[PDB]
Design a protein around this ligand. Structure first.
Ligand SMILES: *[C@@H]1O[C@H](CO)[C@@H](O)[C@H](O)[C@H]1NC(C)=O
Ligand SMILES: *[C@@H]1O[C@H](CO)[C@@H](O)[C@H](O)[C@H]1NC(C)=O
Ligand SMILES: *[C@@H]1O[C@H](CO)[C@@H](O)[C@H](O)[C@H]1NC(C)=O
Ligand SMILES: *[C@@H]1O[C@H](CO)[C@@H](O)[C@H](O)[C@H]1NC(C)=O
Ligand SMILES: *[C@@H]1O[C@H](CO)[C@@H](O)[C@H](O)[C@H]1NC(C)=O
Ligand SMILES: *[C@@H]1O[C@H](CO)[C@@H](O)[C@H](O)[C@H]1NC(C)=O
Ligand SMILES: *[C@@H]1O[C@H](CO)[C@@H](O)[C@H](O)[C@H]1NC(C)=O
Lengths: 193, 193, 193, 193, 193, 193, 193
């Protein structure tokens, strides 16, 4: 939370104020994995996918030049040819910021990955040597409870903390690759056009 | 609480100051489920319904142009035809902000859902296999105590934490659908009129 | 306490500065129920009643136009007829704010209700089935100790937490009804006069 | 401590800055009852009495018009008759603020009352039924240790927490009566002169 | 620490900024009594005596008019007779502030008194009745360890907390007498010269 | 986190604002060593290497003179000869700040060193005397779990805390050498060119 | 950390901003004694010696008049004779501030002394009476672990807390002597030149 208060007053700005808004909203959001073999994937991917869509729509709405764009696109011939495209692309670029920040933040803190890819993941290195031959339905039901400290009661079968750290490392690697690709794309866009 | 201090000074504004007011008021509100089979639904739905109504009335009151609206609507013919409707609709739109923020915040933190829909919910996956045949009145009385950590003393029958996470996920899904529908409506309103 | 720091700088104001003053004073006030069958009601109703009276007097005192009102009311004929009534009613309205805030805050946090109406309340649903036939003097003395966690040592007779939550819900319902009635009255006053 | 930071910037002032100074000084003062039958009363009454005297002297000193008052009172005839009395009374009134704040704060938090009036108080309702006949010297020595959690080791004789709450309620009642009388006096002074 | 942040911005000042500097420096200073019969007195009196001397020297150094004073005192006859004495006395008075604040703060928090006067103090009321006849060298070595919670392991001989509270009360009494005498002297100085 | 809030407002700046950005980002980054003999080195070196590369790219992007550099380098002959090189080198120098801050901070807090060089390190002084003759594959697998408090369960073989402190000291030595070399290079650059 | 935030805004300054920088950097630095008989002295003296050297170099670099000094010292005859020496000495004096602050802070908090002089110190008063005759190599290895709470497991031989307090007192005495000598030197410099 201190990171938001620090990065504040930097723009001082409406463009770079939704970024800290999304970051702080994630910081004050109670992630709760259902820890069920059926609804884990859905919940994880939903937390990963839906809030950025909503932030996109919100950034499109809060821009004071949607009215003019609608008025011009509505006429068969509006009062120029492509200053409209300019402000439209500027609006889209300004809007695309907060979704990227949300996705980066939720990837660096690998809760959604841990909640989503836990039941199906291949954890054969962490499963105990005694219970190394059992129905994968049992392993599904057990591994589903890994992101839940309070519900997991199968310490004699799978080390919970080892698998947690493994999947969190995977999630952080993915987040860093995402950040690098995004920054390269921004570099090309600013250096070409 | 840090989210409110961060989002402050953004408008700097009386319109976008009731939003943080309602958010902070929820943050500093001691939600207390009665954990009784009779008054759970009432308390949950009341916390969900009444404070937004009060915020609506308050936002209507704090606007300095209710006096002029009353004076004009009181005359059979006032000193124009529809600049009154304009300021009235502006007042209503400004007022409708804080109820939406309250409902969104109280849905993302699924306490009201957990308090309200716990006694009647169908929790057959979490009920123990031994006590899978008993009077639904007993299950009513037991499930009523799920939102109360201090009162629940039936660990041999129902896993409390699993059901809590389940209902909290449901509540968060509902909150996200609410936010998306609200944002789409705002988008249409700003893009048409 | 963060709510006061957030709502600060909003008026920026002497009128809307006693509200946060009373709220913060309640936040930093050590409520201590005597937990005796004789002095519970007195203490609860006193905490509910006296501080708003004091805030009323204080708001009357801190207004710089009591001297002029006294000087005019003292003369048999003062130097107009009813600009005095105007400033007097404005002073009274400005003063009536902080008592309302104090009463609302102390009702939402149902300590005074829990301290006051505990010894006399009808708690027959929470009393154990074994001790369901005993002198109501015994129940008086026992229920008096409900708001005190450190003094209550009768867990085999009455569930303390259940009764606490029950009475806190009642208090919050009363507080919400109070807020709604107050806001309706303010609405009528602003819309008529 | 948050109350001081909140009430700050309100005057923005040298008059209403010693009030928060005294309040904060009490907040950051380590009250330590000696818990001995001989020095309890002395310590309690001293903490109640001496700091307000010191604040009075300090408020008299920090006012830049003591030099002129001394120079005029020193002459047999000074260069008017009673503008001196005016500034003297203004200085005295400005000085009398911080002692009142200190006394109110130290009364609302009933430590000085608990430390002072504990050894001599009549606690016959809290003394156990077994030890209801013993030399009042023993009760003196025992009750002296009531404000000390770490020293009290006579739980089989007197309930410490009950007596603590009782005396704290008495102290808060006294503090509220003090505040009411002070505010009434200020009201009369402002409404008459 | 909140007291310093509160008293800040009051002067807004270089004179009244060393006071909060010394107070905060004491607040962030790790007092560590050696708890040995030989070096307790030395450490206590040193913490009481040396830092105020250093603050005196520092306040003398940070004043931009020592160069002129040296240049004038160096000449046999400088370019007036006693405007030098005026600025010298003003410098000395400005410098004497921080030592007083340090001494007051370190007296109100009776650590230095507890560390210094513990081995030699007469604690015959707290010593157990069994060990009331033993070589005062043993009592010296034992009482030396009173300010150290981690080292004291003689609970069967002397109550540590009782003696701690006793000596802390003595220290606070001394601190209050010091503050009163200082304020009286300042009053006389401002009212005479 | 307080260090960032303190060093803020110092530049008041876009150049010296990415430094605190990177420092705060490290402060709010959840380092999680996988504690596996295969992926420890990779994770440690990645955390050490990749974020500074990303900060370099970001500092290159956020500078408003990449467009002009591209436009000039694109032409066979641009509209001078080497004012381009000047602004290019200034941009590169401004960009190189945040990577250095990240590397210094992550070296002073020896987590990456502890995670990376733990499985291969030579810890023969800390290994117990009983298990001083065993397959280095066993020691590899065991030492891999040293940075994980929750996973390490081999206290009868290797002291975890001793090895942790050893490797953290090594990391801090490396960080200090890095800082010294960087500062010497900056000194030469500023004193020559 | 609050001391830095308090002493901030005092200069408001680039000269007196490195002082708080070094103080805060020490506050947010994880001191970790290796607790080995060979590398304790090295680590302690290094933490005491190297960071002030780096702060000296940094303060020399951040001053905007090293370029002019180099340009003038480079010529056989520069465009006056000794205004160069003036700005050079001013730069050196401004640079010497932060090393002094670092050394003072690290001496008042006697970790470096405790880490460095623990293995070689003469602790014959704290060593148990049973183990008062043993090879000083054993005492070396044991005393090396005194600054480490988690590693020290020889409570039957040496009291760890007593020796810790002893060495911390020694370190604080040294720090106070350092501060006094530094202030006297500054006094002489300001009063003579
Ligand atoms: C594996 O299972 C055995 C029981 O067969 C148990 O004793 C052992 O502690 C388990 N180990 C792990 C790492 O789960
Ligand atoms: C279910 O009930 C049995 C008793 O028949 C008990 O042993 C078991 O622990 C219970 N399990 C759960 C998950 O409630
Ligand atoms: C009720 O009293 C019985 C003793 O007759 C006791 O065993 C039981 O735990 C009590 N239950 C409650 C809810 O107080
Ligand atoms: C009163 O004393 C008796 C011993 O006679 C003891 O058993 C009981 O717990 C005591 N009760 C209280 C409230 O002190
Ligand atoms: C005093 O010493 C006796 C042993 O003779 C011990 O039983 C008792 O607890 C001690 N009391 C105190 C207050 O030290
Ligand atoms: C070393 O191993 C032995 C068992 O042979 C055990 O008793 C001892 O505690 C161990 N010591 C350490 C420091 O690991
Ligand atoms: C000293 O060693 C003896 C064993 O000979 C032990 O009983 C005693 O507790 C030890 N005391 C200290 C202070 O180390």
């Amino acid at each position: 939370v201190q990171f938001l208060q620090a990065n504040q007053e930097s723009f001082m700005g409406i463009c770079g104020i939704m970024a800290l808004a999304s970051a702080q909203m994630y910081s004050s959001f109670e992630f709760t994995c259902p820890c069920l073999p059926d609804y884990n994937y859905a919940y994880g991917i939903g937390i990963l996918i839906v809030p950025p869509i909503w932030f996109f729509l919100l950034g499109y709405v809060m821009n004071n030049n949607i009215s003019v764009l609608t008025e011009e696109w509505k006429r068969p011939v509006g009062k120029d040819p492509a200053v409209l495209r300019y402000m439209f692309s500027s609006m889209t670029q300004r809007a695309l910021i907060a979704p990227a920040v949300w996705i980066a933040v939720t990837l660096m803190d690998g809760k959604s990955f841990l909640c989503a890819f836990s039941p199906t993941a291949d954890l054969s290195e962490f499963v105990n040597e005694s219970y190394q031959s059992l129905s994968q339905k049992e392993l599904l039901k057990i591994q589903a409870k890994i992101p839940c400290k309070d519900i997991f009661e199968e310490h004699e079968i799978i080390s919970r903390e080892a698998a947690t750290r493994y999947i969190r490392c995977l999630s952080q690697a993915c987040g860093w690759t995402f950040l690098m690709v995004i920054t390269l794309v921004a570099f090309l866009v600013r250096a070409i056009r």
